[PDB]
Amino acid sequence: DFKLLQDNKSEVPLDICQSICKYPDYLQMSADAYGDSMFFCLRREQVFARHFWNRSGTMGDQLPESLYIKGTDIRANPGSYLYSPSPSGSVVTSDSQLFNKPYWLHKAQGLNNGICWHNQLFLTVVDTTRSTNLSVCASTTSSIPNVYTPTSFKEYARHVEEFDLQFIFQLCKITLTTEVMSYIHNMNTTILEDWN
């Protein structure tokens, strides 16, 4: 939570400086009892440190004097020792592309094998391989005088996302026996409630 843990409002770019960055808890969703949270998962991430930087501001944690020698100026404040790198996603290539491909679910990771309870289906997707930003600019004069000055042009940054979801569903029967149905009741009472 960059908004709550960084009162500086200046440690990370404007994208996240007042937002929350979430990472999927694959460990928790895979250890789920029923496996409804996630029965199909594809991850592919990459990053490296492009530039190394220093953070200004008083160091809240005292650098232990056992780890360095101060030099001749025995009353010298040690420089800032909070290092933060600039991340980078390296090359974006269509060989590493993960979408525009058909994926067939046969065996799920959990016990729920792709069954859409309550006739709904949640699709979470992140794709940062199309992060290009359009820069649109408009002249401040009704028609531009053929001389460029930054004050006579307004600059705007716009971003675009485009999707096309496709699905193949299979119709299924559930014989409402005893033992069963009571198991469904212990699973989700609202399942029987929405049926009859």
């Epitope: 008083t58 160091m59 005292q62 650098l63 232990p64 004097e65 056992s66 101060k70 025995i74 009353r75 010298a76 404040n77």
Partner: antibody, heavy 122, light 113 residues
């Protein structure tokens, strides 16, 4: 905030003596400490100073061999180990707090103790 | 090493008047660093000294607006706008720019009667 000097008495010349100082109300291990004495003629002199961690100490040349400042950050205590004192070192010894670790040792002592007078004479 | 000279050693004044204590050093007192490290302390009778001004012109926490430090290089001054009852004591002038940290010699702010 409390800086309390203590220890130990008025002792013979050429003998040792240990001075203690208990701190309260602030992160003791975060500040550089110092000893400042006031002569019987009521003039103030700088005696010693030790870093936030007990690794860096410095004194004037007038006390280079006799005094040894130390500190226990776990006990929040400051110590001045005086040895082979002469009668000219008679003074009211004050335990003072300087700048924190994240500042250059600016050398101003904002908080002073109550003082412990030691005198050395035959 | 460095010597501190205060003028005068005894400054008798009446309440409500202005007070001025001078302090001169033998060396430049300007550090090989941003600021100049000259300070003013106040000691009252039988009470440990207490910090009054740090770094030539910065009032310590809880110091009234009447106290005003000024100066640079080797010439420094301390001005009290309206001398009050609880301002009487020895004023010390310290330098910590150069090792050893040195200060003298005591300036008695006494009452005029």
């Amino acid at each position: 905030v409390k800086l309390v000097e203590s220890g130990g008495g008025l002792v013979k010349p050429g003998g040792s003596l240990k001075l203690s100082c208990a701190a309260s109300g602030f992160p003791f291990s975060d500040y550089t400490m110092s000893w400042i004495r006031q002569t019987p003629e009521k003039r103030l002199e700088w005696v010693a100073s030790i870093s936030s961690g007990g690794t860096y100490t410095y004194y004037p040349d007038t006390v280079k061999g006799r005094f040894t400042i130390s500190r226990d950050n776990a006990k929040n205590t400051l110590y001045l180990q005086m040895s082979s004192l002469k009668s000219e070192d008679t003074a009211m010894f004050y335990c003072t707090r300087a700048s924190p670790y994240y500042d250059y040792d600016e050398g101003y002592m904002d908080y002073w103790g109550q003082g412990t007078s030691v005198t050395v004479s035959s | 090493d460095v010597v501190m000279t205060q003028t005068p050693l005894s400054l008798p004044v009446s309440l409500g008047d202005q007070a001025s204590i001078s302090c001169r050093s033998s060396q430049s007192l300007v550090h090989s660093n941003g600021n100049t490290y000259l300070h003013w302390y106040l000691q009252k009778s039988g009470q440990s000294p207490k910090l009054l001004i740090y770094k030539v012109s910065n009032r310590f926490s809880g110091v009234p607006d009447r106290f005003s430090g000024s100066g640079s290089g080797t010439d420094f001054t301390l001005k009290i706008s309206r001398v009050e009852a609880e301002d009487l004591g020895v004023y010390f002038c310290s330098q910590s720019t150069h090792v050893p940290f040195t200060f003298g010699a005591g300036t008695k702010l006494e009452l005029k009667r």
